Amino acid sequence: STFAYIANSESDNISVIDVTSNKVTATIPVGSNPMGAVISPDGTKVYVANAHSNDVSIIDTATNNVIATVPAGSSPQGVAVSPDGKQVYVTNMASSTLSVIDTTSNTVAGTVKTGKSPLGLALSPDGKKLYVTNNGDKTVSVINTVTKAVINTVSVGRSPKGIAVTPDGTKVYVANFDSMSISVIDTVTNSVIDTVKVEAAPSGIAVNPEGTKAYVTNVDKYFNTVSMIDTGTNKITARIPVGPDPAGIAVTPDGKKVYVALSFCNTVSVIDTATNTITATMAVGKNPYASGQFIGSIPVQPVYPSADFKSNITSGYIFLSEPVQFTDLSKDATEWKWDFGDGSSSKKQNPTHTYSETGIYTVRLTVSNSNGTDSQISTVNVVLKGSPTPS
């Protein structure tokens, strides 16, 4: 049960996607301008940064329900979850602070002054060090999660954004958006040990489970790509063309797929890490952003409805003004939404419809329940008696 949680900033909701079928299985309303979603290590909770409502939504992965809303700082952007799931970290861009949230009480247990305009954050594997990119300061703040103090300020490039730590915790990669480079930090000394020059504006960063490769989203008018970086040489080895303004990015836990949210297109592109090719691009909410750990396996899967139906159409076609009987065959559905493909619709389970003009119509059935949604399509050929029949 592996899923992706995409924050649709302009529709104030979260798109849940089954990474196995690349299908959106649910849409969860949250706060205002959700800019980030992250799943806890155990996969039981998802945390969402609502930029315009200065708070965090907490979602129960078993029911897709928001169970709480914790107030944060000014303009929350990114979230990270401690290895045990007891503390949630949030970057507050406008107030240049970091909120530390206690998950046993779901309340703010600390506020740390970061660099100017913090954005990206990534936690060390042991959970003791948090790394924050101060986007408006050309620096990364290294915070001691125990003392809640910045123990070191690493100098990086201009407008640092995306940031990630390797699985073995030896290196932290930093995307310097305006400097067209990627800083590499040695966690042992918090020293920049290498700066990788790139073709465009590096934005998001994600290291694969093996720690061998790091994927980077690069912004450039018309030449947007998803680049790869060999963690052993710190050199780009491949570039994959993607839609405009790629931002956030994540690798699936099995390392087979790469998810990229295209805010400008209201879609999410899926890449096969084996062939470095785009194997799918699906629609989500408006202005999707997905930073950090937004993909993970959950122990309990919510009971999703399964759309399916049939009609009284036998010959593959139907005559003009001849009624069509639709029978719902969906599983675990409590709500129906029929689109006949002619501008009319229905909310009845088993609707009847008559078309007023000949033609080929697309009939879509969208079923839903407290946990999510599912859809089914069907083509209906309406013709006159004696007219040519379909193949």
Inter-residue contact 216 to 193 (CB < 8 Å): no
Reading the block at residue 339, the tokens are 């689109």
Domain boundaries, the chain: 1-301, 302-391
- How are beta strands 129-134 and 139-144 bridged, if at all? antiparallel
Provide the terminal-to-terminal Cα distance of the chain, rounded to the nearest Å: 39
User: In whole angstroms, what is the distance from residue 299 CA to residue 312 CA?
Assistant: 41
Phi first, then psi, for residue 20 (nearest 5°) are -85, -40
Resolution (A): 2.4
User: In whole angstroms, what is the distance from residue 231 CA to residue 198 CA?
Assistant: 15
User: In whole angstroms, what is the distance from residue 367 CA to residue 220 CA?
Assistant: 39
Inter-residue contact 45 to 60 (CB < 8 Å): yes
Strand positions, DSSP E, 222-332? 225-230, 235-241, 246-251, 257-262, 267-272, 277-283, 288-289, 295-297, 309-311, 317-319, 324-328
The closest alpha carbon to 97, from 73, 128, 129, belongs to 73
- In the chain, the amino acid numbered 138 is K
Reading the block at residue 220, the tokens are 């450039």
CATH of 302-391, one of 2.60.40.10, 3.90.950.20, 3.40.50.1820, 2.40.50.100: 2.60.40.10
User: In whole angstroms, what is the distance from residue 333 CA to residue 89 CA?
Assistant: 37
- How are beta strands 359-369 and 335-339 bridged, if at all? antiparallel
Q: What's the CATH superfamily of 1-301?
A: YVTN repeat-like/Quinoprotein amine dehydrogenase (2.130.10.10)
Sheet (strand 45-50) strand order = 34-39, 45-50, 55-60, 65-71
Cβ-based burial of 172 (10 A; exposed 0-12, middle 13-18, buried ≥19): buried
Inter-residue contact 229 to 196 (CB < 8 Å): yes
Inter-residue contact 16 to 8 (CB < 8 Å): no
Q: Which experimental technique did the depositors report for determining this structure? A: X-ray
Q: What angle do CA 233, 277, 120 make, to 5 degrees?
A: 55
Q: What angle do CA 12, 15, 20 make, to 5 degrees?
A: 170
